[PDB]
Structure formats: C-alpha cells, structure tokens
Design a protein around this ligand. Sequence first.
Ligand code: NI
Length: 341
Amino acid sequence: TCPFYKKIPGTGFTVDAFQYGVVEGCTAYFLTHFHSDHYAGLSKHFTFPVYCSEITGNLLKNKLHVQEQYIHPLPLDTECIVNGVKVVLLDANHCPGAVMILFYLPNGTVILHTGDFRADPSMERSLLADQKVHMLYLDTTYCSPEYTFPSQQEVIRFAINTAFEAVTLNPHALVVCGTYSIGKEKVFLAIADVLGSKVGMSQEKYKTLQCLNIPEINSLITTDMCSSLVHLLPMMQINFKGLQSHLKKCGGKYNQILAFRPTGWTHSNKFTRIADVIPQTKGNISIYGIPYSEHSSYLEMKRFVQWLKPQKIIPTVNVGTWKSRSTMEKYFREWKLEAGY
Ligand code: NI
C-alpha cells in the first residue's frame, strides 16, 4: 500500500506515488522529477492531475505519452494555488527539472518535501529563508558520515583535463560516457566542449535531451555518430566486452577508448582524493569511475538541516530496514543537540 512518507497530511496530496493504483482520497499527484523509481506507474492511460515542473512535464508528454490535459506544469519560485492550498516549487540541484515542494497547510503548518536533492548553501537564500518549516520530508540517500565526495566542479575539471590530454596525445582515441537516466549531463557536455566535438547518441537519448530546455542544445548534441568523437552509450555497455564490441563498430576510425562511468559513491572515496583516481585498463581500453553525485554528501545534508531547524524529519530513502531507520534517527538527534533547536 502507499507508504505514509508519500502522503502530505491535511491535504489530498501525494508525492512520487504512481505505482499503487488509485490512492484513496488523493486529489492531486505531484511528481518531483523524471527518474523511474519516482514516476513508476505513469503512462498514456493516467487520468488524474499531475503537478510538476515544465521540464518534467515535457518528458511526461514526449517520453511516456501522458495526455496533455492531465499535465499541470508550474513555474519555479512562484506562489501557486492547487486545490485550495498554497504551494511553491524550488530547484532541487538534482537532475534537470527536479524540484523540492513547499506546502502551506490551511492550519498554518509548513512542510518541505525535498524530493531527491543535493543540498547547497544557495538554498539558504531561496523562498525558504522567509518562513519557518515545521516538517521536512528528507532525501537521506547518503545519510552516514562515510559518504564524502568532491564538488561537482572538481570532478568536471578532472574529467575535462583527462580527456583533453588523452585525445591530444592520440587524435585517434574515442571518448565514451555512460548513462541510464537523465542527470549528469555536465560530464559529457564539458568533455565534448573541450574537444570541439558534439556528443553523439541514439535517437531515443537525443529525444530525451531535447526536452530539457538546455540553452544552445542544438549546437552541442547529434545523432550522427560518425561526425562525433564523444559517444554516449547505455551504462550497461561500459565494460571491456561492451567497449571492444563498440570499437569494432566504428570501422577503424579509432584505435583507443577512454571511457567514463559517473557513479554515485564508491568506497575508494574513504581513502583516495580526486587528483589520485586511476582507471581500469585492458589493452587499448581504459575506464574511469568518477564520483559525480546528484545527492547531498553527509556534511551537505547536515548543514542544510541544521540551517532549516525543522520540528520533525521524515526520511524518504533507506527506510526499509530497522537498522537504517535507527541509525538515521541517531544522526538527526545529534544534529539537533549540537545546533540547539
Ligand atoms: Ni533521482
């Protein structure tokens, strides 16, 4: 059944709750972002109102074929009324079109639902600075102190310098980048930019990217593989067998692959710095795992929550085990006692 952490009390609203059939007493289904664990269950047959960002609304229409009459896009940073309740959508610093949602309940309670987010100090100067938030529905993906990772900026610098050096040393090297969802577009766009190439990809993935309102996108991507030296492939194909195979397909235009796998966290983060990352190499193929995260580190999550000072925290991630639930609740109490709220 729909879990309680997907329901907004004092409303008929649900968040990211499309796989339970008709949720009894739901008058509006919000969708925070276009990732499959969140939209799971949506299709052209859905006939309830969906509230989301403009970009998520483009993807619902073009990729899932949801009918336009049920898609209700809202602008960001704007007070809007939905079924008699004031809401605001805020940028979540996750993937394109990802939002956090502020609900102002008739009884005076204010609730923030982060969806998936990467906390940032810039959020401390949004519409959130303007009033008290009583309840926080929190993306707790990396809620443990082992989870450190570099800034997105540091990671992109590493990737750009690595690719540029490799291709300048060997003009017949191909760069390949993996993907299995929207998000992390900076990785392949930054590398293609330094190399003066467009990124080449399948027709399905090109269609997906043309929904994202990225400025000058027609100048940056293409379905012509032969004219491009940065290819995108399914994350599943980013391994020695899949890459050798791919190389055969390019008809001796290339004699070396340098490949990037943008992971979330991996245990080499507890020891190694970004400056010291090395690839896995077999023959003329090398694969770099780079820690490009679109979720908060433990320290970023802690700073956000200690700034916000919520009265109650409801985790939305890692809720399935008693040991995870108990560990998270211990950190929430530490944070509250350290900061004095
Ligand atoms: Ni997500």
